[PDB]
């Protein structure tokens, strides 16, 4: 009942005051907190309220109670910080066990409350009700934990780890090792908490940061600063690098994978290399803004909106239409476009991924996250030292784990592995592209046979069961493996690895992939395109080729390519170069001209080539115009040789045996 | 070379040149279309001069500007009381004295929309006084209804003013008092004229309906009338 609920809440409040309180004799305005008694029982009973009650009933009500009475912000952090500062001063000089016990049992609650949130169709209605509000409260937790004394509570957690680093592995009991797992499990939650995702019941078709929280509190930039001042990056760097020497690999390496995923996620690598500067590029952007303003002006009438006359346009067969506006009097192109624009109907439209926080898989990554100069150099230093020190040893251990455990996997671990691989391989390739001080040998563990088999197996199993998110992530990873191979061949076993990478079964799979992409989100099709480009280029430099290329060329691939290309206003300069490379391959080299004689391509070249779309001076227009000239030349030749293609241009090609062969050629 | 935008044109020159003898009548009978044709002709000619003579002037600057013709000396002046319903939408010439002018009124020309959920934005053209609001947000992944909304202070506006012109005493009927007519004037010609000025004007003689009430589309049978000036002398 409500009264039972409030009785438990009042019990939690009385436990939130039995804990202790500061001293009013102190004359120190204010002093620190001061300690109560029965507090072991208080912390233990609170732990029981989480585990023995809330988990068994699947509520999150207990968390709502502790959030109501603000236990984390008010008691746990000053208890831990007082313990840390007392022991710190004692170390400067250079029943106490009970102090240490209270430190441990406070940290465990800190891990529990900030634990990340999952919602399914099997979660209770209570949890589904309480999801949106506990998100707000956990955002408050992240801000408060990073704020206090410029984040000093994080030093306590690594001191607890240092107690278990201290003495030899040969002595270290299982309960001892649980501490070393716990301290990293803390940092994963502190990184993972981020602004909420809005969710509603789909009953009818019709921000969540609380008033005390803002973006700069919650941004990753703040986390980089807070971590550096409180001495975390040294702890992670020294722990990962010496992992090979008899730290029991089983307890550490998956959480230590999760951290590296959880702040590589929202960075583009170009932002970390530069390739008054800010003001200069701002001025250039203002020039671009002026160009857009000019585009609007060129469609703007001189005289006012009620001055306008009326226009009549007569067709062949002497039928007449009517359009208004002054610009229609002079511009027939605008009149024709405006005539069709009035019509009401649009055909309604069809729509792939869920259950995972935001990442490259389901967001447009043409949007950076922004760094201070100190933060930029500190983050660069951290991941550079990580790559030069820790990458190979970590990947060897985690990959020779998963081969023995692939059957038992969950979707999180697959997507984590595949997006850790990709990020670090790509970053090393770009850094060695830039400068000679870097080398490619730092990431060379990816190529050895076991990891190649595992990435292949993940992609295989994901594709067969039609799990499309893991298929996407495996696509990204397999792309980076092929890119790295093309790097190393430009310098023995790598050709053996290529020959095993391009057995006929894999050619069947990799040829199958772009065809299904037509239905899915924009990112899927882009991944398919870039993978296809790399795949075909590697087999170009193998010297089989004619068999493989004919496997790719058919209608559904071209459909995907055109469906992707018509959203060019959102895309990069580079992707269009890739698309027109493929169109050059189809049209000129292979001489399979008949595929592209289809009408929705002819509309696209008008839209993209007009003064509307692609800029007059962007590099794209060179490629586009140079393609369209040849396209219309060959089309002229074909149409005059056989006038039947006028009706042909609307429809797909015709698959009948007796007429189809002459149709295609 | 002086960086100016408006060209005078006394209509009698159209009668001198043989190819434009009929264009003179078409100007009087169909002002709204013909004047627009003349404007777009002038702008294209200005571009053609710099590109053909290959001069140093910025093409973008000339493309940005608006150019307008302003015809005058159209014909015989017409008495204010003698304008009849068969003169609607034809060019007219009047003489009179200025009584008063209202302050400048802002007149909207372009609307600005913003999506509430995804922050997509669109600029929309105003014609015939009606804002053509989109039905759904046009971003591909945010195809939702009722999702766009107007932002007032990011629209684009233009100046309008109303001038009250009085009949000169030379035309008043015997044993009667003079009448007055209202002129609507835009942009360049807004603040030209003061109380007590004596002027001659040239403009289209328009008429429009007026509503019975502000709640509904019910119109009255009688129509308001006014003049839409394009030149003042």
């Amino acid at each position: 009942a409500d009264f039972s609920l409030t009785v438990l809440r009042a019990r939690i409040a009385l436990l939130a005051t039995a804990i202790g309180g500061p001293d009013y004799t102190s004359q120190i305005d204010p002093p620190p907190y001061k300690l109560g008694d029965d507090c072991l029982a208080c912390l233990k009973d609170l732990k029981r309220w989480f585990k023995l009650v809330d988990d068994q009933q699947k509520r999150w009500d207990v968390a709502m109670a502790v959030a109501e009475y603000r236990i984390l912000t008010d008691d746990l952090l000053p208890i831990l910080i007082d313990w840390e500062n007392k022991c710190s001063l004692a170390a400067k000089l250079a029943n106490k066990a009970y102090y240490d016990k209270i430190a441990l049992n406070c940290l465990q609650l800190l891990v529990l409350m900030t634990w990340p949130l999952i919602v399914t169709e099997q979660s209770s209605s209570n949890q589904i009700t309480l999801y949106g509000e506990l998100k707000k409260h956990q955002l408050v937790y992240k801000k408060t934990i990073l704020s206090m004394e410029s984040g000093k509570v994080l030093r306590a957690a690594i001191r607890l780890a240092l107690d278990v680093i201290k003495i030899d592995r040969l002595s270290r009991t299982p309960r001892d090792n649980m501490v070393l797992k716990l301290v990293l499990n803390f940092f994963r939650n502190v990184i993972a908490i981020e602004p909420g995702e809005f969710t509603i019941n789909t009953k009818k078709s019709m921000d969540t940061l609380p008033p005390n929280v803002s973006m700069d509190d919650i941004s990753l930039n703040t986390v980089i600063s807070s971590f550096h001042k409180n001495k975390v990056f040294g702890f992670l760097l020294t722990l990962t690098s010496s992992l090979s020497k008899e730290f029991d690999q089983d307890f550490i390496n998956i959480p230590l994978l999760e951290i590296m995923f959880y702040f590589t996620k929202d960075v583009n690598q170009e932002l970390l290399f530069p390739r008054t500067s800010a003001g200069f590029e701002l001025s250039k952007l203002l020039q671009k803004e002026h160009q857009m303003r000019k585009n609007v002006i060129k469609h703007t009438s001189a005289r006012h909106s009620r001055f306008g006359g009326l226009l009549s346009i007569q067709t062949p067969d002497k039928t007449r239409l009517t359009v208004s506006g002054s610009q229609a009097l002079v511009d027939e192109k605008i009149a024709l476009q405006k005539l069709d624009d009035s019509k009401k109907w649009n055909k309604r439209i069809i729509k792939a991924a869920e259950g995972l926080p935001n990442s490259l898989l389901n967001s447009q990554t043409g949007k950076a996250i922004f760094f201070t100069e100190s933060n930029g150099k500190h983050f660069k230093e951290f991941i550079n030292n990580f790559i030069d020190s820790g990458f190979n040893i970590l990947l060897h251990s985690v990959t020779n784990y998963f081969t023995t455990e692939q059957d038992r996997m969950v979707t999180l671990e697959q997507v984590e592995y595949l997006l850790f691989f990709a990020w670090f391989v790509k970053y090393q390739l770009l850094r060695s592209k830039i400068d000679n001080s870097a080398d490619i040998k730092q990431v060379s563990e990816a190529l050895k046979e076991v990891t190649f088999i595992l990435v292949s197996s993940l992609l295989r199993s994901a594709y067969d069961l039609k799990n499309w998110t893991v298929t996407h992530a495996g696509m990204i990873a397999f792309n980076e493996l092929l890119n790295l191979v093309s790097r190393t061949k430009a310098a023995t076993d790598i050709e053996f690895i290529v020959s095993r990478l391009f057995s006929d079964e894999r050619i069947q799979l990799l040829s199958n992939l772009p065809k299904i992409g037509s239905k899915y989100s924009l990112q899927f099709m882009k991944s398919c395109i870039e993978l296809t480009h790399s795949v075909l280029k590697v087999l170009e430099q193998y010297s089989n080729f004619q068999k493989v290329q004919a496997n790719y060329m058919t209608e559904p691939v071209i459909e995907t390519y055109i469906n992707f290309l018509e959203r060019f206003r959102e895309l990069e300069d580079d992707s269009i170069k890739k698309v027109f490379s493929f169109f050059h391959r189809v049209f000129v080299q292979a001489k399979e001209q008949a595929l592209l004689f289809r009408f929705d391509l002819i509309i696209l070249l008008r839209e993209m080539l007009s003064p509307d779309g692609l800029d007059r001076m962007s590099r794209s227009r060179k490629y586009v115009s140079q393609f369209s000239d040849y396209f219309l030349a060959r089309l002229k030749k074909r149409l005059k040789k056989s006038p039947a293609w006028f009706v042909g241009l609307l429809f797909p090609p015709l698959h009948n045996s007796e007429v189809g062969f002459y149709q295609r050629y | 070379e002086l960086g100016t935008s408006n060209l005078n044109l006394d209509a009698r020159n159209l009668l001198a040149y043989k190819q434009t003898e009929d264009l003179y009548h078409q100007l009087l009978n169909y002002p709204q279309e013909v004047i627009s044709i003349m404007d777009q002709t002038i702008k294209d000619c200005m571009v053609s001069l710099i590109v053909d003579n290959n001069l140093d002037y910025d093409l973008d600057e000339i493309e940005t500007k608006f150019y307008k013709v302003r015809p005058y000396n159209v014909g015989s002046c017409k008495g204010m009381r003698e304008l009849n319903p068969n003169d609607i939408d034809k060019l007219i010439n009047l003489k009179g004295l200025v009584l008063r002018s209202t302050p400048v009124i802002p007149d909207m020309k372009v609307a600005f929309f913003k999506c509430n959920v995804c922050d997509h934005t669109m600029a929309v053209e105003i014609d015939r006084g009606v804002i053509q609001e989109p039905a759904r947000c046009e971003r591909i992944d945010c195809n939702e209804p009722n999702s766009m909304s107007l932002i007032h202070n990011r629209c684009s506006f233009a100046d309008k003013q109303v001038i009250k012109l009085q009949e000169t005493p030379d035309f008043v009927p015997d044993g009667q008092t003079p009448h007055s007519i209202s002129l609507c004037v835009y942009d360049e010609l807004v603040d030209s004229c003061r109380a007590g000025d004596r002027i001659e004007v040239t403009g289209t003689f328009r008429s429009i309906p007026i509503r019975a009430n502000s709640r509904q589309r019910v119109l009255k049978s009688l129509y308001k009338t006014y003049v839409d000036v394009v030149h003042v002398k």
Partner: peptide, 11 residues
Amino acid sequence: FKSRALNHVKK
């Protein structure tokens, strides 16, 4: 219940 996240919300 037909719970649903605003997957398309990215601004």
